[PDB]
Amino acid sequence: TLSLWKREQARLKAHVVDRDTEAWQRDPAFSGLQRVGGVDVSFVDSVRACASLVVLSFPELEVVYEESRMVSLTAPYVSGFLAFREVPFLLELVQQLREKEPGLMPQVLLVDGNGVLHHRGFGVACHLGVLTDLPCVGVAKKLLQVDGLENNALHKEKIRLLQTRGDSFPLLGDSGTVLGMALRSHDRSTRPLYISVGHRMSLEAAVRLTCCCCRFRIPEPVRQADICSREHIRKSAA
């Protein structure tokens, strides 16, 4: 069973704030936003992997902080509980930065994965967000099939309606609640991004921010985190 994980997960889920809490979020151009973070864990198997934390200036989107660590994810792989394998390394990644170079601390994290759009309403973005007490956004490349959501023909039809970079349609679960937003992040891309609330940010602002960070199809902090992880996995493979 997973009674401990389920309990910890519900306990933390109750902490989730799905509204804007920071002044810069309430500004139409994110005035007062200076640092956006990006995190990524990428696999070699499902055990040895790389965890990367990146911090970018905003709105310039230049790398001002970068850190990658090879790690062993030996915790059980159970669907709906993946955060429990990855978050302690990401958290440790958010804790050294705060203790060592807190001036480079990101005001928000962009996470490759999901937020409330999740099997148990508490993806890695929520987990990390709550555990760090940082505003946090889930930016997934695939649609997680929860609450009746699925990438069928209808969904793709909705994707076709997305015309411009910044166009979006709501991901409406069967429970009547909006779980996230499909976002067209570039004029020339085809597949949308899937945005959901992690912590301390409204869905609307999460989408707008993700778009603001998209120099290319993938939001720059997430992209750079992936680049770092990739480089370290290649370097390790040597």
| Whole-number Å distance between alpha carbons of 136 and 38 | 10
Tell me whether residue 110 is exposed, middle or buried, using C-beta atoms within 10 angstroms of its C-beta: 0 to 12, 13 to 18, 19 or more.
Answer: buried
Backbone angles phi, psi at 155, to 5 degrees: -60, -45
DSSP 184: -
Contact present, 134 and 94 (Cβ < 8 Å): yes
Can you give the resolution of this entry in Å? Answer: 2.3
User: Does the annotation flag 40 for ligand binding?
Assistant: yes
Angle in degrees, CA 185, 209, 125, rounded to 5: 95
User: What percent of the chain is helix, strand and coil (3-state, nearest 5)?
Assistant: 35, 25, 40
Contact present, 191 and 6 (Cβ < 8 Å): no
User: Across the strands, what pairs with 37?
Assistant: 55, 109
DSSP 192: P
Cα–chain center distance at 186: 18
| Whole-number Å distance between alpha carbons of 65 and 90 | 15
Instruction: For residue 34, give Cα distances in angstroms to 60, 141, 189.
Output: 9, 25, 27
Amino acid identity of residue 101, one-letter, is E
Token pair in block for residue 182: 């499909």
Token pair in block for residue 198: 């992690």
The runs of H, that is alpha helices, within the chain are: 3-13, 83-100, 124-132, 153-161, 203-212, 220-237
DSSP 23: G
Cβ-count burial 162-192 (b if 16+ within 10 Å, e if not): beeebbbeebebeeeeebbbbbbbbeeeeeb
- 104: how many CB neighbours lie within 10 A of its CB? 15
Residue 59: cis peptide before it, omega within 30 degrees of 0: yes
At a CB cut-off of 8 Å and minimum separation 6, what does 10 contact? Answer: 122
Indicate if the alpha-carbon torsion angle 68, 87, 30, 167 is positive or negative: positive
| Whole-number Å distance between alpha carbons of 53 and 229 | 9
Longest dimension (CA), the chain: 50
Q: Is 181 helix (H, G, I), strand (E, B) or coil?
A: strand
- Which of the following CATH numbers is that of domain 1-238: 3.20.20.450, 3.40.50.300, 3.90.550.10, 3.30.2170.10? 3.30.2170.10
User: Does the annotation flag 112 for ligand binding?
Assistant: yes
Contact present, 221 and 110 (Cβ < 8 Å): yes
How was this structure determined? It was done by X-ray
| Whole-number Å distance between alpha carbons of 106 and 94 | 9
Indicate if the alpha-carbon torsion angle 67, 70, 75, 76 is positive or negative: positive
Token pair in block for residue 234: 């290649």
Contact present, 42 and 226 (Cβ < 8 Å): yes
Token pair in block for residue 183: 């976002």
Q: What count of Cα atoms within 13 Å lies in the side-chain half-sphere of residue 182? A: 23
